[PDB]
Design an enzyme around this catalytic site. Sequence first.
Site, mmCIF file in Angstrom:
data_model
loop_
_atom_site.group_PDB
_atom_site.id
_atom_site.type_symbol
_atom_site.label_atom_id
_atom_site.label_comp_id
_atom_site.label_asym_id
_atom_site.label_seq_id
_atom_site.Cartn_x
_atom_site.Cartn_y
_atom_site.Cartn_z
ATOM 1 C CB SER A 197 60.641 -16.093 14.544
ATOM 2 O OG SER A 197 60.827 -16.514 15.999
ATOM 3 C CD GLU A 324 67.772 -13.769 17.486
ATOM 4 O OE1 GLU A 324 66.545 -13.427 17.768
ATOM 5 O OE2 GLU A 324 68.204 -14.228 16.401
ATOM 6 C CG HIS A 437 63.338 -13.296 18.409
ATOM 7 N ND1 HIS A 437 64.050 -14.005 17.757
ATOM 8 C CD2 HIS A 437 61.881 -13.743 18.296
ATOM 9 C CE1 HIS A 437 63.363 -15.069 17.279
ATOM 10 N NE2 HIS A 437 62.169 -15.058 17.706
HETATM 11 O O1 LIG Z 1 46.669 -17.090 28.533
HETATM 12 C C1 LIG Z 1 47.076 -17.546 29.396
HETATM 13 C C2 LIG Z 1 48.358 -18.142 29.394
HETATM 14 O O2 LIG Z 1 49.409 -17.485 29.105
HETATM 15 C C3 LIG Z 1 50.674 -17.870 29.530
HETATM 16 C C4 LIG Z 1 51.480 -17.887 28.482
HETATM 17 O O3 LIG Z 1 51.476 -16.706 27.548
HETATM 18 C C5 LIG Z 1 52.741 -16.172 27.367
HETATM 19 C C6 LIG Z 1 52.978 -16.197 26.012
HETATM 20 O O4 LIG Z 1 54.295 -15.580 25.783
HETATM 21 C C7 LIG Z 1 54.978 -15.866 24.514
HETATM 22 C C8 LIG Z 1 56.297 -14.981 24.579
HETATM 23 O O5 LIG Z 1 55.949 -13.626 24.206
HETATM 24 C C9 LIG Z 1 56.963 -12.950 23.274
HETATM 25 C C10 LIG Z 1 56.259 -11.978 22.497
HETATM 26 O O6 LIG Z 1 56.743 -11.978 21.113
HETATM 27 C C11 LIG Z 1 56.363 -11.191 20.242
HETATM 28 C C12 LIG Z 1 57.327 -10.812 19.286
HETATM 29 O O7 LIG Z 1 58.115 -11.626 18.459
HETATM 30 C C13 LIG Z 1 58.568 -11.156 17.254
HETATM 31 C C14 LIG Z 1 58.658 -12.179 16.297
HETATM 32 S S1 LIG Z 1 57.555 -12.633 15.093
#
Ligand SMILES: OCCOCCOCCOCCOCCOCCOCCS
Lengths: 532, 532
Positions: A197, A324, A437
């Site tokens: 990633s 993904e 992913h």
């Molecule tokens: O705190 C207030 C704001 O929050 C709103 C946005 O936050 C959401 C974040 O989401 C990001 C996506 O989450 C996916 C999690 O991925 C974890 C696993 O990834 C594996 C690869 S290293």
Amino acid sequence: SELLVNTKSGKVMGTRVPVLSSHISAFLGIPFAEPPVGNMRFRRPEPKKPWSGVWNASTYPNNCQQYVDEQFPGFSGSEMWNPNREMSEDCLYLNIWVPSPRPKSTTVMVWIYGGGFYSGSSTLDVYNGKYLAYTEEVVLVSLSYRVGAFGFLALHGSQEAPGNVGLLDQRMALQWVHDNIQFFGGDPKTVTIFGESAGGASVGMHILSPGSRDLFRRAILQSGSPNCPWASVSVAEGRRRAVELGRNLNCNLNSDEELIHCLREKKPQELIDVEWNVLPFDSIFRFSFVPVIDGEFFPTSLESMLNSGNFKKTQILLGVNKDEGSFFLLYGAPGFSKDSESKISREDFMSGVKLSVPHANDLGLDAVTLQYTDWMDDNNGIKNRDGLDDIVGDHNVICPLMHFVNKYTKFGNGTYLYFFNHRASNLVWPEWMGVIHGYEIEFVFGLPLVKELNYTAEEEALSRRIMHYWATFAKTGNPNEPHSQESKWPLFTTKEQKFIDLNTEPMKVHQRLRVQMCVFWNQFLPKLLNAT
Amino acid sequence: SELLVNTKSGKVMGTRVPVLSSHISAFLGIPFAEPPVGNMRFRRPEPKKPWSGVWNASTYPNNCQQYVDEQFPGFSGSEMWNPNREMSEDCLYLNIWVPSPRPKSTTVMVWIYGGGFYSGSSTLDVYNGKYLAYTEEVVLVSLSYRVGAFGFLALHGSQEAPGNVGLLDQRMALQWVHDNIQFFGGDPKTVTIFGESAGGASVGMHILSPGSRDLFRRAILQSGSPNCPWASVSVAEGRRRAVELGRNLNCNLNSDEELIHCLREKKPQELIDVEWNVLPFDSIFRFSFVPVIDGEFFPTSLESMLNSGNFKKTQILLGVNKDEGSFFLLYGAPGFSKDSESKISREDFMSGVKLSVPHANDLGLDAVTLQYTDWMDDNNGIKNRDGLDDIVGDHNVICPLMHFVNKYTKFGNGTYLYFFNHRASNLVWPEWMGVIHGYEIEFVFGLPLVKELNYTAEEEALSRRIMHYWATFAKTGNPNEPHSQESKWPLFTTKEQKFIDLNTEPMKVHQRLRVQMCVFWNQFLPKLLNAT
Ligand SMILES: OCCOCCOCCOCCOCCOCCOCCS
Ligand SMILES: OCCOCCOCCOCCOCCOCCOCCS
Ligand SMILES: *[C@@H]1O[C@H](CO)[C@@H](O)[C@H](O)[C@H]1NC(C)=O
Ligand SMILES: *[C@@H]1O[C@H](CO)[C@@H](O)[C@H](O)[C@H]1NC(C)=O
Ligand SMILES: *[C@@H]1O[C@H](CO)[C@@H](O)[C@H](O)[C@H]1NC(C)=O
Ligand SMILES: *[C@@H]1O[C@H](CO)[C@@H](O)[C@H](O)[C@H]1NC(C)=O
């Protein structure tokens, strides 16, 4: 002693660790940079001042300050990615796993963690390098780097917060490996950097950046490439977001000096609490602080660099997983839930596409919708869910990676492409998410070899095959064994574009990975968005 | 006598003609309008002045002046469409086939020939109405109308060359049938107008035009609809082409009066020799003189008329053939030939798309290309040839017809849709052309019933089925027999959108005919072209 190593920075004391009924050496928490604290926050890394005495490298180091996912408290599926050590700005350290007895000059593999440039730790269980170090007899290194604003706040023009410092943290770790890995039995002229990633995007960025090229031999990219739409921003956007961050913390915005000084007095968690408020659009798979095309780390646009062949030429092994996009839809698209089949209605589908391609106008959104809708059955919940899943994956990972591999292969010395499509038997996430992913990592690091983890015999066999491919590629620049009887992973050529699947079934060779959809994302859509 | 009929225009004498070992009455060449010659050229038709004595209607009339296809001299495939009678501006006549003994008040079917509004004759062998008249016992009428500049030169504003006069010729013939068919045993309140290609577009235009609606009961449209991109032009484009025509003949272009007067002194063949020079683009499936949206025959745009339900509401039966586009690619796209398999290279494919969508910019051309290309095998000659074939057919016939049927069905009283996909066993055209534009006609007119023509037994059975569907629909507004045991042709509803195939195999019901491609041609592309 085998656990004592004298490096150019000073002496280090490791620890013996068990692994698959045997043992190897581990040097955890070796510092490679000065703590980037106080007035050092946002600044380029500084080399660690040599120390006298013996540095105790028997325990993992702190993880860098970052956003912590709390969406599913207690759920191993999500917590396996959260930092498992106390967080701190004092987090620039690296870990080394050395075969025992200590090798004299063996292949080195350096791991760069992912996490959207806003999170990540080198200490996660899925990144434990002992299985790979022991099984393939390579010296395995895992570095760390500042994430979020701490590593990517960009105020181009100032030297107090230039941007890309997180990438420079990675480089300094690579510089340290180059200069000291020989004392651990590693060969500095045979270093392979690999990551997943954002870590994969990072690997590609070091391939492009002139200042990084000389620090490694070969590269492996997993589910990520430097040209991903979420992996970088312009200096103008970077500046806009930094100012917006200051605005969220009641900072004086009269000058970079005022802004930066204010951000430096804030506690880490204060910056993290408002980090997501600076995004320009309502979106998914978009992160606040990422690398900036500064004209330094990256001399020119990534596209022009790829077209002119302005990059390190060597062999590369890279690929993607089947689904993904599912993680990002679960976390941010309406209609998707962890405990339901997430059949998506027509309304949520369209909401999802707008969120997935936040930079597109209405015509562009229609183009995408038309491209992924089965008009013979447009109300099919399963089809809408999977179509949206493919949209996010194709746009953010697969197609950007295919564009990269095709551009690179023109000047490169060898390319090997894979498509990981095996869903682990012990997967805790719901079925609809498929081959998620980040879930090929556990196979790359050999977790399936430990029985207590509950994988099947075929999955262990798959893990061993993958680990041997990776290590063999790292060692020779070719994943295949010399004069072996096993099926051959064909080279990816500009003409035939071959690739293989990675699963428990007999190897199968394919061509033009998702070419139909990627012609849309790489050629048509951009042309449409620009003409309007 | 059974061959003598007294109409409101005067007495007519027909002739007995043999048909399938029997006989019926034929009244050929009955005039319904004053000859549109001399100062009458380009003018609206004038009703035929009643005559004393007996009009001899035993022989076919002259065909209207038109372009004659000479691409394949002697080839029956193309010559079966050329006029088979001397051409003349004195060509406004109609033909009637009456069952014997003469019926008292039976179903009437009026045929309107196609030919891109630039050609066509009511006297072609494939249009012989005796087989249908005799087999289904209906009174079959075939009318005629001016084509080319003679019938569609449009100088909006002037009453000397208003445009659409060819459509008014058709209407006057329909008015004559309405007023006189009763004397031939036909029922004027049960008249079905049917036609193919431009004839099908014409049928749809009479359904829209307020001045035509009251002259018929039901309608059948074959491979054509009023909204086809080639079926009409704006008054500005019509005017531009008329002036360009005058420019090609060294006419005084100072005023409509000057232009029109000059065009009237020219011999028919002089206008025809330069007819194709006025087209605005390098294209295929585009004809010079066609109906104009004048605000009279058509009160407003066809689209707004279709949306507001501004049209005759009744039952309709319509459909298309599988390979509508092949004829036009053979005649005008590079790479296609009559005697080769016409495998198209990549270069000719793209040349073909530009020719097929002449009104599109580069972005639009890319959209089309992307939509019809298999990027997993883009150099496949067979695939490029068939893709181009589908592009021309979908854009010019199928999708425009699907848009019409969906809009009409919202206000209509009954719709029956078909997909003709049977390739005749005695087809003289090459295999690659498939189920060609215009080749369902021979089945509608029952040619397969005559053994000397060399059709198979199944093809005769197919012809009988189709003729009975058409006639039954004409008679009741439903192609199916009351309380029959045969398979039922389901009604096309706005919700389920059902349709049937028309071939020698057992009936099969389908849904959403070519919906995937038509969403592209009817919704996306127009939106893309307009946004740029
Ligand atoms: O705190 C207030 C704001 O929050 C709103 C946005 O936050 C959401 C974040 O989401 C990001 C996506 O989450 C996916 C999690 O991925 C974890 C696993 O990834 C594996 C690869 S290293
Ligand atoms: O004369 C000089 C100008 O000529 C150039 C253009 O002329 C080419 C005309 O081509 C028109 C397309 O030909 C297709 C033939 O269609 C005949 C069969 O149609 C069946 C339905 S009625
Ligand atoms: C350094 O050495 C100590 C003493 O044995 C031991 O605890 C460990 O190896 C290192 N320190 C810590 C806190 O673990
Ligand atoms: C890689 O480079 C070597 C030497 O420069 C060359 O001989 C070899 O053919 C190259 N291999 C590929 C796949 O380009
Ligand atoms: C009108 O009658 C004549 C005389 O029989 C006959 O030839 C035919 O029926 C009609 N005219 C022509 C030229 O055929
Ligand atoms: C057609 O109209 C009649 C009477 O107006 C109505 O009863 C019938 O349901 C209609 N049929 C369709 C298919 O709309």
